[model samples]
Target: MNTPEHMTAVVQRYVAALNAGDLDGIVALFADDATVEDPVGSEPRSGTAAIREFYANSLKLPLAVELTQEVRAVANEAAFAFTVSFEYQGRKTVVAPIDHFRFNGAGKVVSMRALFGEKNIHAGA
Candidate 1:
């Protein structure tokens, strides 16, 4: 597969596993020392172990993400822009312009970072 197709497949599986609440499946996609940053204020969760914990805890909540668009750079990295809907504090919130993704050589996700919100909706605002 080409770079764009490869990246798309990587993210597709990642998101599918996440939405499916497949914690082990999601963790299997990352490197041993992979790092994940969910939001701007929180410190990044490092390593597959920590990442698995984070996802396990997060999946406990009723959450779902809808990928609106995926624009990728094809050198050695890829990024995705998406939207998420979930009940936070018993209130349903829809956050758009969310970015979720990974960087890998063959098909595994090495390092991943997720960025959300647009210019108006700041990271902590």
Candidate 2:
């Protein structure tokens, strides 16, 4: 059920949805039991409800989302590097993360883990 083309399209749609702050659009790409782990070591948000809430907090900031490198899709997994930037209190912060998505048999994302650390964050002077 998972194909390279479809996975790539999903990643593109994810970035687009983030840029638009479309919470529903982002959640629609996941399976009901999907889990999201942003920054790897953080507690993962599982299921539709928790995932939605996780993204809800994310969208509180208007994000400038951009894909920073080519998306690598092989088998039922895809990974890509991207950057999310937002301004708050006159300070701009940019976070660069490499996010990995694992697809289920039904083609929905079952697991998403974002790999990054403090070094990946940049602050505007």
Candidate 3:
């Protein structure tokens, strides 16, 4: 298992990738057979291809992402709260979500889950 510091760095890199809309950068942090579950309730996307597709769809619109709190990492798991903002139809929307990443022995993310609900989404001017 990787150290907390490495996990924390992965969390930071993930945010940067999202903000830059870099699909490849986002996917590179994951294991070949990683899984992603956005919003928690949705079905998980497994493996590199599915994970890539998921992020690709998400990055269709430019995103502005910011970490809202310090990353908490321990035992090869890391969690962080962040805000993702994007404009659609001339209106801005921001979603606050807490995302968790579980790292494998090699330090690649093996699983990622985003915890958020409708209440976490807000409209912005």
Candidate 4:
């Protein structure tokens, strides 16, 4: 497959995994030594094992993840916008995050950086 198509497919698989709460499915797309930096500024979780743990924590809630925009891919990198929502306490909280993924030579995700800020979080009443 072509570069953009392949990258987009990967993104689709990721969102599907998130929505399904399939932790194993999510980690299956990454390289053995991939790094994940959620919220962009936080310390990145390195390696497949750490990545597995990170996603494990994220899946504690049934997150409704959805892609909000087209997947933009070029070179060996891809960026996409999406939202993750779940019930928190008694309210629904939604976070709109822009995630960037860098693929290795074998097309496995080597780097994942999620960009989100306070302003991106909305709690629905």
The root-mean-square deviation over C-alpha atoms between each candidate and the true structure, in angstroms, is: 3.8, 1.9, 1.7, 1.9
Cα lDDT tens digits, model 4, 1-125, are 34888787777877887788876777777777889888676799988788888888878777788987777777677788888887777888888888788885345888888889888888896
For model 2, the local distance difference test gives: 0.81
Can you tell me which runs of candidate 1 are displaced by over 4 Å?
88-90, 100-102, 118-125
Cα lDDT for residue 3, candidate 4: 82
Question: Where does candidate 2 stray beyond 4 Å?
Answer: 104-107
Better of 1 and 3 by TM-score: 3
> How does candidate 3 score on lDDT?
0.81
Residue 34 lDDT, candidate 3, scale 0-100 = 89
Candidate 1 worst ten-residue window by lDDT: 116-125
Q: Give me the displacement of residue 55 in model 2, in angstroms.
A: 0.8
How much is the lDDT of residue 59 in candidate 4? 80
Relative to the true structure, candidate 4 reaches a TM of: 0.87
Give all candidates' CA lDDT scores: 0.68, 0.81, 0.81, 0.80
Clash number by candidate, in order: 0, 0, 0, 0
Between prediction 2 and prediction 4, the one with superior lDDT is: 2
lDDT of 3 at 82: 90
- TM-score of every candidate: 0.78, 0.87, 0.88, 0.87
lDDT of 2 by residue, 1-125 (tens): 67768788888888888788877878876787899887677699898788888888877777787987778877698888899887778888898988788985445788888898788888894
Q: How many backbone collisions does model 4 have?
A: 0
Give the lDDT ranking, best first.
Answer: 2, 3, 4, 1
